[PDB]
């Protein structure tokens, strides 16, 4: 224990004196903004590093140390940091002109494009994040069905203030929210079942992102589609980061259809983006001409986005491109689970595809109560290691594959792991 | 009269734009009206919008219109300017995507504090209503209150809207709606349920209603209630701070607790910020507050980038000065046709923002426009796309820098043929 808090000093002092120009940065951005931040996950101690540059699946930092990105927008940066399709087709519709202020002749085509690669959006709208198509969502499902309730899971992110520990985040809205337990679904038939008359909407991610890659089961899943249609209740997934999963998705590739899906991060092409969409029947209720519902939002439409996001699925994110990157994924989750077992140490990589998260526990992961005794300075330990193999990950421990990343790099993270085992068989804890 | 008048508009306008009724017939497939936005919508059917360049706007079908409108207000700097585009190809050339602090943000959040130095500390969002949830979230917070005072007729964004009651859209909050302009309802009702309420959240001049001004008194019944009982007042200038150099409520010398910021402010890119005072912005500090505020594109190098070019080349204090002095003569002048004419019609605003109504006497709140003949406004539209001016159905007129002194001659002008030629429809003053 003390020699943890020792190897973390240390971490912190070295990684301090190597990146001054990213230290004086943070001082004085911190004058405007809290903590120098304006998005929480970006931030870590003892103060995050200001990248300066990105170019293929590259970063650099303020201090000119060159990264292989291993994070990637948090799975909204896809196609690297300098795709010239995706660059080329914003230039193109910049000298349209922008701010077009009417329905254009870019949103019909990416709006058309999503319904094809994801079938059960019979129609959808554009929004500027995933917190909004999932309030958008929660919305639409509480005036279709003239109910207030909302089922939701322990661990279950859906946005800035649609977050959930065991309870809502302080920051969440406050719905009739019902947090019921990620992955029983026991407790979930029964549950709904017991509040039928009351429950709008099941809302559930099919693979949770942010509380560390945790795949929904089978049975789970199965059991919510059942017991929505049996109380009346809408299912919603939440596919923003599941999306990219599959050819067509998560919720597809897994045989199951909710009542409406939400979207977001690279569907826009790497420009703010978001989007809900489903049954045409529900969406009806936004039909300017008919529908009792409004939704407005001054960019909901923009040029940029609209552009971007087709150009993007269309030459480079194909569902084949999903389908093979998700392949890879696999076989890097597998690589190093198994140098985690061989090497006897209490630690795994849970996830799907192209997306996985570091995990300093032995065993089953199914929610994110079997990772609330973890040690958080280990995966801080990890964090500043990778960086030391020139390695840009996430704090948490969220690892996520784009495009431009090659076979060597993947290389370089296994090898990185393999290293920090090795260097720390005293400090982090067996397997038994 | 009016059913024919308005029968032969549709005609009209159907005839003229068979491109974008064609489209809007395929894009209603795979958008419910074939829409992603409500306010863009009008019967019997939207144009689609190809092409923009300055203050000029191309339909599908080619025509080419002054505009008046200009993205509700986002689009300040027309449609072209090439220091926003110079400044977001600078940025992309740099790489986007970043997943970290990166090297624009803070040049952008300094000059926001520091032109409205209510804002002390901020932080970004992507939209207006982002900023007005996460505004919201902090008062609660901060406080440790739950009612949060708001005003009939306001606009807040896609789930904040309010009319008598909060819209079936609008998340439930603990909403206290009060009517606008009502010094004394306010000031009885914030003391009534003070100890509850967390927050009061009111625009300096609401947009959606009809650009309709807080009068002073009201404004400062604000202040004074709410620092009375302990509430924070934020003023959502997500339009608002244009219309002046440091925005309105600077010009009116009131000081909010917190400030919601969008539209123009990130170059004509996605953009919403939220600040104000330290105190309570701490409640976002990492190191040790305890409320997280994460959404990926919140810091994108694309806005930040768009937004400084555009805020220090552009629309400078002195140009916001300079475009609300131009407002204000246009509004002026619109008046004194309408006043000139005999007829029941006026533009109601501050500067550079005003909007067409069709009634008499002082505007002060949505009440007063309730009884409205929609139709007329329907009329104007129409009328307005006849004379190739391109602007809002609800009568929303919004200037931008490429305007020229002869564009805007060409909107009092075609208000002048629209009275000569519809005076036996259009209701009579006194
Ligand atoms: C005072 C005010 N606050 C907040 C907002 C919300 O800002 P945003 O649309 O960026 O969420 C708006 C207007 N939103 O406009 C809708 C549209 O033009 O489609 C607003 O007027
Ligand atoms: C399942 C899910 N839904 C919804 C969301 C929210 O989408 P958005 O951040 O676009 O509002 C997210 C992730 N948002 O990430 C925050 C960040 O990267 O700063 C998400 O994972």
């Given at each position: 224990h003390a020699a943890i808090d020792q190897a973390l000093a240390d971490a912190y002092r070295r990684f301090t004196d190597a990146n001054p120009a990213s230290q004086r940065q943070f001082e004085a951005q911190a004058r405007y903004m809290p903590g120098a931040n304006?998005?929480?996950?970006?931030f870590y101690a003892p103060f995050p590093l200001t990248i300066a540059r990105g170019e293929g699946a590259a970063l650099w930092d303020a201090d000119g140390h060159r990264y292989a990105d291993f994070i990637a927008e948090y799975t909204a940066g896809v196609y690297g940091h300098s795709a010239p399709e995706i660059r080329d087709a914003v230039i193109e519709a910049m000298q349209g002109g922008i701010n077009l202020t009417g329905h254009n002749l870019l949103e019909g085509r990416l709006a058309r494009l999503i319904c094809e690669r994801f079938?059960?959006?019979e129609q959808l709208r554009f929004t500027n994040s995933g917190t909004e198509a999932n309030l958008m969502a929660l919305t639409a499902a509480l005036h279709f069905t003239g109910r207030r309730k909302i089922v939701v899971f322990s661990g279950?992110?859906?946005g800035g203030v649609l977050g959930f520990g065991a309870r809502p985040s302080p920051?969440?809205?406050?719905?009739?929210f019902l947090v019921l337990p990620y992955n029983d679904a026991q407790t979930a038939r029964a549950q709904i079942e017991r509040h039928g008359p009351e429950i709008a909407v099941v809302l559930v991610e099919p693979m949770q992102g942010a509380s560390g890659c945790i795949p929904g089961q089978p049975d789970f899943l199965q059991a919510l589609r059942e017991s929505a249609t049996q109380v009346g209740a809408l299912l919603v997934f939440d596919?923003?980061?599941?999306?990219?999963?599959?050819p067509h998705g998560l919720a597809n590739k897994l045989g199951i259809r909710s009542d409406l899906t939400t979207l977001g991060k690279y569907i826009g092409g790497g420009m703010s983006f978001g989007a809900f969409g489903g049954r045409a029947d529900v969406m009806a209720?936004?039909?300017?001409?008919?529908?009792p519902l409004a939704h407005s939002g001054?960019?909901?439409?923009?040029v940029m986005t609209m552009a971007a996001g087709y150009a993007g699925l269309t030459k480079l994110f194909t569902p084949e491109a999903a389908g093979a990157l998700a392949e890879r994924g696999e076989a890097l989750r597998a690589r190093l689970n198994a140098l985690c077992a061989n090497e006897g140490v209490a630690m795994q990589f849970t996830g799907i595809g192209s997306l996985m998260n570091a995990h300093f526990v032995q065993g089953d992961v199914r929610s994110s109560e079997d990772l609330?005794?973890?040690?958080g300075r280990l995966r801080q330990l990890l964090f500043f290691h990778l960086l030391n193999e020139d390695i840009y990950s996430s704090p948490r421990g969220f690892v996520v594959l784009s495009l431009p990343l090659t076979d060597a790099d993947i290389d370089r993270y296994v090898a990185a792991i393999g290293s920090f085992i090795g260097g720390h068989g005293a400090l982090l804890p067996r397997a038994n």
């Open positions: 304006s998005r929480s996950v970006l079938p059960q959006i279950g992110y859906h920051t969440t809205v406050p719905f009739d596919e923003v980061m599941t999306s990219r999963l599959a209720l936004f039909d300017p001409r008919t529908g001054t960019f909901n439409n923009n609330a005794a973890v040690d």
